[PDB]
Write a structure and sequence with these properties.
The complex is a heterodimer of chains A (521) and B (48).
Chain A: E1 2-7, E2 20-41, H1 51-56, H2 70-83, H3 92-99, E3 112-119, H4 126-136, H5 138-160, E4 166-177, H6 180-193, H7 197-207, E5 219-225, E6 260-266, E7 276-278, E8 285-288, E9 310-313, E10 318-323, H8 332-344, E11 358-368, H9 371-376, E12 380-391, H10 398-413, H11 434-448, H12 458-465, E13 477-479, E14 482-484, E15 491-493, E16 503-505, E17 518-520
Parallel strand pairs in A: 2-3, 2-4, 4-5, 5-6, 6-8, 7-17
Antiparallel strand pairs in A: 1-2, 9-12, 10-12, 11-12, 13-16, 14-15
Helix pairs in contact in A: 5-6, 5-7, 10-11
Chain B: E1 3-7, E2 18-22, E3 25-29, E4 41-44
Antiparallel strand pairs in B: 2-3, 2-4
Classes of the chains: A alpha/beta (521), B mainly beta (48).
Family (chain B): Belongs to the VgrG protein family.
Protein name (chain B): Putative type VI secretion protein
Protein name (chain A): Putative type VI secretion protein
């Protein structure tokens, strides 16, 4: 169906003759090769989150939107400091990229090839508002970066194959994302479904004008999503930038968006700033025990210097001033904290995470300087109470199980992956997690075959609870680049530099009632 | 100036072959008489 021309002589002389020279070339059969471009949209990885993303998390989660005045917020910070930025680890998109089989030089008979592309995560005074708007619109910008990276990958592939003997008969895409690369991935897939002209432009600029058959913007073979969170934070309450409209992110996956679509979902992700965009009911979706970065990866190993140790406020710390004679355990804040602790000890959301650490109510008592009451003889103390969870050396081995489930789904879809070998010791599963991984893989098959997965038993869910991180907490963070109105909760970016104040956010605050917000399609 | 003309081993010009003429790159597709755009070595692509 395709034809090329073998050229004996292919050079000529320029002049004022402007002579046209025949170039006799014989007509050679040309292979039709199906070229698949693996698009890998990461979240955060072995990187820290930039200031703009962390400040976006202030939206709806600042200490002012909660009933936490600035004095109480500084007391929360002091409390946490007295009881006890973050860089993540390689995600599962990193490992899928490393394991995605790359084709560099095709064989004499090879009619299908794979090339791969890696796009980083969205988060990785004057500019600060523009930076937060860039993160807010990060999904579409990352799909544009994906187009440029597609051009680069096509250039590299056709630079490994000089004087081609083949025509690219089809351009396929295997799009993989972790959460903000997942919305981006979905957005990218929609741009491929809408046959975006920028995709065809990138394919042409990478093939350097070479003819490729098929849809000019390509087709998506497999869509692999790890935990779709379209936005982590917001800009609605930022006075400076809330005027900008929502980004035109397309997250709905219609039955022709791809040939196979698979999502894994975190069953124990409960944060407010991490709400799920689910494909359940329309496409195969597997809910798997774990947190957000226990499904998509991103937690450092047990023995690293960046080991994940959880010292977490599981209740918002509450402070009140009382008489110094009053017993700390006879205080309203202590009663509230104990109520929260007994609620969490029965909550099914943390049923399997709490038995692997110690859950306590922690009390802080400081003195309160009130000279007026000192003259009356009344000495006063500020008593604060919170619920604390302490767990040490949380293993990150459940994201390898989620990796293997996504690998099984993609390999069913037709994607070629290099085997997971003993050479990869970062991907090797503990014995405790070996059989469970098989079960998880089987569960994936069940959701892919349309059936219902055989759920993990409570003993199995306990063993998995060794490996799932508690990502929702009431730990307070601060920044000096914002001022939040104590009454309205509106955020005002310090456009001329920090003013010496501290604005307080609960970045990883749980969703209300400890139930994650799910947006279905 | 000048250009190329693509023909088979037997003299039938090839109408819509892609080409890349490099001196800077001038891409294009040959005309009905298998003629490049006026402008060097030419690389000819593939046809359906």
């Amino acid at each position: 169906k395709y034809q090329g021309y073998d050229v004996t002589d292919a050079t000529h002389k320029t002049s004022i003759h402007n002579d046209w020279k025949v170039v006799v070339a014989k007509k050679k059969p040309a292979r039709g090769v199906t070229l698949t471009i693996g698009i890998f949209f990461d979240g955060t990885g072995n990187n820290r989150e930039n200031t703009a993303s962390r400040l976006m998390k202030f939206n709806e989660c600042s200490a002012a939107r909660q009933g936490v005045n600035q004095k109480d917020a500084q007391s929360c910070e002091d409390f946490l400091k007295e009881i006890n930025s973050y860089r993540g680890y390689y995600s599962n998109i990193h490992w899928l990229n490393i394991l995605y089989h790359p084709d560099q030089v095709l064989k004499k008979d090879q009619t299908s090839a794979q090339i791969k592309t890696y796009i980083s995560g969205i988060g990785t005074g004057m500019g600060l508002g523009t930076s937060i708007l860039d993160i807010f619109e990060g999904v579409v910008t990352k799909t544009d970066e994906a187009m440029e990276r597609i051009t680069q990958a096509l250039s590299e592939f056709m630079g490994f194959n000089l004087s081609p003997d083949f025509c690219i008969a089809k351009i396929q895409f295997d799009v993989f994302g972790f959460s903000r690369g997942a919305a981006a991935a979905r957005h990218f897939a929609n741009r491929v479904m809408e046959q975006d002209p920028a995709i065809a432009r990138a394919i042409a600029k990478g093939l350097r004008g070479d003819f490729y058959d098929g849809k000019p913007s390509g087709e998506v073979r497999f869509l692999g999503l790890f935990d779709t969170v379209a936005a982590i934070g917001g800009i609605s309450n930022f006075f400076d930038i809330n005027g900008r409209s929502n980004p035109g992110v397309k997250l709905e996956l219609r039955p022709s968006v791809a040939k196979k679509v698979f999502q894994i979902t975190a069953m124990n992700e409960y944060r407010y700033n991490f709400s799920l965009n689910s494909i359940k009911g329309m496409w195969p979706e597997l809910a798997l025990p774990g947190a957000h970065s226990d499904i998509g990866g991103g937690y450092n190993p047990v023995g690293s210097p960046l080991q994940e140790n959880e010292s977490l406020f599981l209740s918002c710390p509450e402070f009140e001033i009382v008489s110094d004679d009053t017993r700390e355990m006879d205080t309203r804040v202590y009663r509230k904290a104990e109520q929260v602790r007994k609620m969490l000890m029965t909550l099914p959301a943390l049923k399997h995470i709490l038995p692997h650490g110690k859950l306590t109510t922690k009390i802080r008592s400081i003195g309160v300087n009130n000279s007026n009451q000192r003259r009356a003889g009344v000495i006063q103390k500020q008593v604060g109470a919170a619920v604390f969870f302490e767990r040490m050396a949380v293993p990150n081995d459940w994201a390898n199980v989620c990796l293997r489930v996504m690998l099984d789904a993609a390999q069913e879809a037709g994607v070629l992956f290099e085997p997971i070998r003993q050479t990869n010791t970062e991907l090797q599963l503990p014995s405790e997690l070996i059989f469970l991984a098989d079960k998880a893989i089987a569960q994936g098959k069940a959701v892919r075959l349309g059936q219902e997965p055989q759920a993990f038993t409570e003993e199995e869910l306990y063993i998995i609870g060794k490996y799932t991180h508690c990502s929702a907490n009431w730990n307070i963070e601060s920044d000096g680049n914002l001022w939040v109105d104590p009454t309205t909760g509106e955020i005002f970016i310090h456009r001329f530099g920090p003013k010496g104040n501290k604005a307080f956010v609960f970045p990883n605050k749980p969703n209300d009632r400890w139930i994650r917000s799910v947006w279905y399609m | 100036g000048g250009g190329f003309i693509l023909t088979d081993e037997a003299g039938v010009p090839q109408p819509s072959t892609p080409y890349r003429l490099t001196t800077d790159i001038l891409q294009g597709i040959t005309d009905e008489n298998g003629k490049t755009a006026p402008v060097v070595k030419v690389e000819f692509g593939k046809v359906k």
